[PDB]
Amino acid sequence: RPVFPFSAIVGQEDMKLALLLTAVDPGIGGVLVFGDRGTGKSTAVRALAALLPEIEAVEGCPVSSPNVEMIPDWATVLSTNVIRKPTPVVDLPLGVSEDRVVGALDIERAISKGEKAFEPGLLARANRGYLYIDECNLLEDHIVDLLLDVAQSGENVVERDGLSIRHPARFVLVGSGNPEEGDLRPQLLDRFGLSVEVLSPRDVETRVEVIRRRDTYDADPKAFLEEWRPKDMDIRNQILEARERLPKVEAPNTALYDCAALCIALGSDGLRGELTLLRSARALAALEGATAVGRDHLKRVATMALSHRLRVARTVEETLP
């Protein structure tokens, strides 16, 4: 199944960087995408997922276990053969029920013969992949809260109905902020790692170029990919190498000092803010092959890492000249 390639997407610089950063260090947290209706905010996510190496998993496993030994006890898998498949991208549609999101035990069949009665949901499908929410700000507080928690913990625990069901749920959470329903609960916004704006281009020349590329891709997806995949593979190599470099990238005191100074100068105070800032800067350094995090890495990611946590660019050049 061909997917419009990442490298052929026009503009969306910050969106692309955010996806590369969290591809390198998912510990940065979820990505919040602000923009209007037609920005096609999940295009970049699906493209990134498509340029990443396919994952190995037990064919019949609902949570994509890497091997038979990791298959959850509540799961019933017949096809134990390990295969290669694309990194999954799961859409979280508005109005979805909690049970379809987290999964639920068929209490009826559970009394028949227990645990094996658990019916996995979207979280199971998103394991080892991405979870995209098109209208996050329209989602119910308790659902978002739950998704943020699992995205952070990397595990889904359903301790309801007299059972303790659990399975791996490690994924990059990408929530889309539709135009404007009400700049919702600041309590949740602060739980997202990065925020980016993806504005639709207003000049007809850029829109036409965007239309032209998609139309050409549709004319022959295979041929389009042949043309762009070398660039997508360069992006893949950059991420994979960055991951290998990550643990060795240095974080000198000066970097921590800038991190602390910038956050103090701002409204978005500390730790959560300071740590995300530092983690994002280091991921960037790893991406650019830098030995240590410097003031520039910090300045480049500051807006994406801090903007959404206020009650920034001005404060950045001022605090970190």
What DSSP string describes 139-184?
A: S-HHHHHHHHHHHHHSEEEE--TT--EEEE--EEEEEEE-S-S---
Of the candidates 42, 156, 25, the one whose C-alpha atom is nearest the C-alpha of residue 92 is 42
Taking CA atoms, 277 is separated from 56, 160, 307, in Å, by 32, 37, 11
> Would 1-199 and 244-321 be classified into the same CATH topology?
no
Structure tokens at 184: 């919702």
Q: Under CATH, domain 1-199 is a member of which superfamily?
A: P-loop containing nucleotide triphosphate hydrolases (3.40.50.300)
Q: Annotated binding residues for ATP, as ranges?
A: 35-42
Q: Which of 170, 207, 272, 295 is catalytic?
A: 272
What DSSP string describes 226-278?
A: HHHHHHHHHHHHHHHHHHHHGGG-B--HHHHHHHHHHHHHSSS-SHHHHHHHH
Taking CA atoms, 243 is separated from 23, 95, 146, 283, in Å, by 9, 36, 28, 8
Burial of 282 (0-12, 13-18, 19+ CB in 10 A): buried
Q: Is 96 helix (H, G, I), strand (E, B) or coil?
A: coil
Which run of H or of E encompasses 117?
none
Partners of 57 in beta bridges: 83
Q: Identify the DSSP state of 28.
A: G
Cα(267)–Cα(309) distance, rounded to whole angstroms? 8
Structure tokens at 295: 């003031």
Question: Domain ranges in the chain?
Answer: 1-199, 244-321
Cα(216)–Cα(180) distance, rounded to whole angstroms? 33
Structure tokens at 203: 């000049």
Q: Is 90 helix (H, G, I), strand (E, B) or coil?
A: strand
Structure tokens at 282: 């280091």
10 Å Cβ neighbour count for 90? 18
CB 160, CB 105: distance < 8 Å: yes
10 Å Cβ neighbour count for 287? 24
Active site residue 272: yes
**Cβ-Cβ contacts under 8 Å for 172 (sequence gap 6 or more):** 19, 22, 23, 26, 30, 31, 129, 130, 131, 151
Please state which architecture CATH assigns to domain 244-321: Orthogonal Bundle (1.10)
What DSSP string describes 37-70?
A: GGG-TTHHHHHHHHHSPPEEEETT-TT--SSGGG
Declared resolution, Å:
2.1
139-142 long-range contacts (CB < 8 A, ≥24 apart) are 139/92, 139/94, 141/185, 141/188, 142/98
**Cβ-Cβ contacts under 8 Å for 5 (sequence gap 6 or more):** 47, 50, 51, 217, 224, 225, 228, 229, 231, 232
Sign of CA dihedral 17, 20, 26, 27: negative
Cα(173)–Cα(152) distance, rounded to whole angstroms? 9
Sign of CA dihedral 95, 192, 155, 247: positive
**Cβ-Cβ contacts under 8 Å for 183 (sequence gap 6 or more):** 137
Structure tokens at 55: 């994952």
